[PDB]
């Protein structure tokens, strides 16, 4: 359909998305399926499969508004951040895209001519060897609070495993909060209980 | 706005020289971005101590609140920047300022496990009895997040 689906779909390759703190200012609540992170900072995401995707498969990340009232509206950066020098010197990423990939010169930035949806794709790569997971580094390029952009409206990040021709093989979704103190926002969500 | 925006960017980025030249060229030290963050907020959050000192000595408002109700001290405490917490306190930061959820800096240091920051906040009169929006003291946030060294310290100060 035109509105992107946000329902987990493991599909035939048992596609899953997980988070792991290593030895960074992000926190992920496995309970609320919610990422708390800072603007422009590295958020590593781990992709699991059980069988190898086909030749030319990709991983797409697309932001969508969570609330029914907002879901038709394309998530993108606020004019302040789109037009600033800050974070925008020497990027493949168009400066309006909320989601960037860090550390992969094969990132493709897509904007649908009809829906206006913006997303970022990488070619699917199997994990290193002996490693369980394919790691994708994301950066989120506006605060949730950005006036003229998300304007405090909650978003989902929709991660899809797809064939080269855009057939969806797998889908996982999590909420993203981009804020100054991720643990503080996390604690306030948890304590609202 | 030109220079204000440039100062906000240099302050977040830790560009010491650019901050210094921008102040020299008349940049507004209390320029605020659309989140209501001042250069002092951004430098305190990102741990840029020299920039913090330059901003305070050129008239930065030490107790400016952004749109979340954070002061620079909230950001320095959460993000674990002890030297900055000390400089902010010595520049008259409000030790018991509360954000939009009633979190104090001692709440944020307790929550994140920053023992040394807890100790300096207490020395400057941090309120162990302060309660957030959810009735929690810094001791309770310490217990919830499994910070036991901090919990013991906050008890002995109660
Ligand atoms: Zn923005």
Numbering used by the authors:
A (entry chain A): 125 to 147, 152 to 321
B (entry chain B): 2 to 159
Quote what the paper states about this structure.
For the initial development of DARPins as tools to study the p53 protein family we have focused on p63. This transcription factor is involved in the proliferation and differentiation of epithelial tissues as well as in genetic quality control in female germ cells.
Using ITC titration experiments we measured a dissociation constant KD of 108 nM for DARPin C14 and 32 nM for DARPin G4 while no interaction with a control DARPin could be detected. The structures revealed that both DARPins bind to the DNA-binding interface and interact with the helix H3, the preceding loop and the C-terminal part of β-sheet S10 as well as residues in loop L3. All contacts between both proteins are summarized in Fig. 1D, E and Supplementary Fig. 1G-J. These data suggest that interaction with the DARPins competes with binding to DNA and that the DARPins act as a competitive inhibitor for DNA binding. Pre-incubation with either DARPin C14 or G4 resulted in complete inhibition of binding to the DNA oligomer while a control DARPin showed no significant effect. DARPin G4 bound to the DBD of all three p53 family members (205 nM to p53 DBD, 223 nM to p73 DBD) as this DARPin was not counter-selected against any of the other DBDs. The transcriptional activity of p53 is inhibited by co-expression of DARPin G4, while DARPin C14 has no effect. However, co-expression with DARPin G4 did not result in an increase of the transcriptional activity as DARPin G4 also binds and inhibits the p53 DBD.
